[PDB]
Amino acid sequence: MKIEEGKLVIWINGDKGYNGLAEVGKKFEKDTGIKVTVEHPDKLEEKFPQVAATGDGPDIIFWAHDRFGGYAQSGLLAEITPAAAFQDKLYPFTWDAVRYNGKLIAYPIAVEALSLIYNKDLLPNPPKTWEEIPALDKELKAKGKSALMFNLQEPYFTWPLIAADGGYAFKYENGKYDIKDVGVDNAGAKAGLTFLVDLIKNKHMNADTDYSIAEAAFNKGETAMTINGPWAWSNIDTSKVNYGVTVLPTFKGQPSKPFVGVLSAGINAASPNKELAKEFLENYLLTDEGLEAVNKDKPLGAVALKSYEEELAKDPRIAATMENAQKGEIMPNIPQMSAFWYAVRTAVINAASGRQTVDAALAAAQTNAAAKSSAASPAALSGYKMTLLALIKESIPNQAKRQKFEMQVGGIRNEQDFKNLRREIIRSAAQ
Ligand SMILES: OC[C@H]1O[C@H](O[C@H]2[C@H](O)[C@@H](O)[C@@H](O)O[C@@H]2CO)[C@H](O)[C@@H](O)[C@@H]1O
């Protein structure tokens, strides 16, 4: 289905404040007459690239920033054009998360970091260390409860522990990521995953626990602690559990190092509604009133808009969010992040199951994370890229098409990639 002109379709994850976003959409419609439809499809981070590659999909995509370099390199994202005066309204550290190869590729919305969330009735003082959690579990088990439940199906939640004593995604030096140097199989990563697997082997956690199961257990007062982000606070408030949000536990005397996400909004390169999307994002969503509507539905975290974050940062739950963020890393946004996350997802699930050792799981993850296709020689690759750039500038009269094709040129790695992109450019017809 072609993207409808004179309408905005927005995709956002189902754990986010989509109903509040729809309220901002209602205001946009009141003022402009343009309908805004918000959807939250399953497997969004996969659905978007698959559908947008066909030239279709939502006008606006929301996800954490880590996936956006890959979307941009695939030609799925428009270059955004915020004026300096608009840029000044948002924190510089959030703009840096949505810059790729020298250009802005999305609008930053809010900073997400995992925290330890604990039930103050069950546990007045939260543990400072991971190592003390088995003993805590033993006492809570005696009471028919447990110490800790969190999602073991998404490696986002386990990463802070894997990273604590030295695990890393890609080596980051001189401001550049070396995609051949993956750190998921070093001593630190092994130690962190081993600790997780031991918690499971010793019946302090269950490998099958997912988002829904952990949330229900915490929100029904069955488990003393969970690990989650700001979006989860709404449902805890509803449950009336008396909870705190705090610094993650240390492991081997090192802070846990969560990978920090910036919820970001990109504009589909194929959208015929780029100006409407800019108007909605800049002048409806990224305002005190817009962010309040979304935040009241599900908390966004530490919002990128200075004027509204001034108020939200009073909250100790936001202070704890940023305490954790400061101990972790803003995620890379490079295209290889998808392969990294696949590799670690697989390793955590397989090791947690008890059917594969940690060392075997992480050895495979190291190989899986760095996997890439054949490379042309550097000389040949530069010649292909320069050919395509000149071809695009000569032959593609539509600006958005030129801009997306030039981003695609950045991702070619070999002669086959060159030939395929050449075919895409030559086949292009009147817009
Ligand atoms: O588990 C890997 C997954 O981690 C991150 O996804 C987070 C997302 O950032 C949060 O906004 C929240 O929704 O939970 C997700 C984990 O289920 C990465 O952003 C994502 O790319 C990656 O696959």
Numbering used by the authors: 0 to 370, 1329 to 1388
Mind quoting what the paper says about this structure?
The paramyxoviral phosphoprotein (P protein) is the non-catalytic subunit of the viral RNA polymerase, and coordinates many of the molecular interactions required for RNA synthesis. Following the coiled-coil, there is a flexible linker that varies widely in length and composition between paramyxoviruses, and then a structured binding domain (the foot domain or X domain) that interacts with both the L protein and the RNA-bound N protein. Here we report biophysical and structural characterization of the C-terminal region of the P protein from Menangle virus (MenV), a bat-borne paramyxovirus with zoonotic potential. At the interface between the disordered linker and the structured C-terminal binding domain, a gradual disorder-to-order transition occurs, with X-ray crystallographic analysis revealing a dynamic interfacial structure that wraps the surface of the binding domain.
As in the prior crystallographic analysis, each of these proteins was fused to a non-cleavable, modified MBP tag, optimized for crystallization. For one of these proteins (MBP-P329–388), crystals were obtained in multiple conditions and used for crystallographic structure determination. X-ray diffraction data were collected to ~1.3 Å resolution for crystal form one (space group P21; two molecules in the asymmetric unit) and 1.55 Å resolution for crystal form two (space group P212121; one molecule in the asymmetric unit). The structures were determined by the method of molecular replacement, providing a total of three instances of the molecule. In each case, helix α1 of the BD is N-terminally extended beyond Ser339, the previously identified N-terminal residue of the domain. Helix α1 is capped at its N-terminus by Pro335, which orients the preceding residues (329–334) such that they form a clasp or latch that runs across the top of the three-helix bundle. Superimposition of the three molecular models shows that this latch is equivalently positioned in each case with only minor variation in the side-chain hydrogen bonding that mediates formation of the latch. In particular, Arg370 and Asn371, located within the loop connecting helices α2 and α3 of the BD, interact with Ser330 and Ser331 in the latch sequence, through their side chain guanidinium and carboxamide groups. In all cases, the main chain isotropic B-factors of residues within the latch are significantly higher than values in the bordering helices of MBP and the BD, suggesting that the structure is quite dynamic.
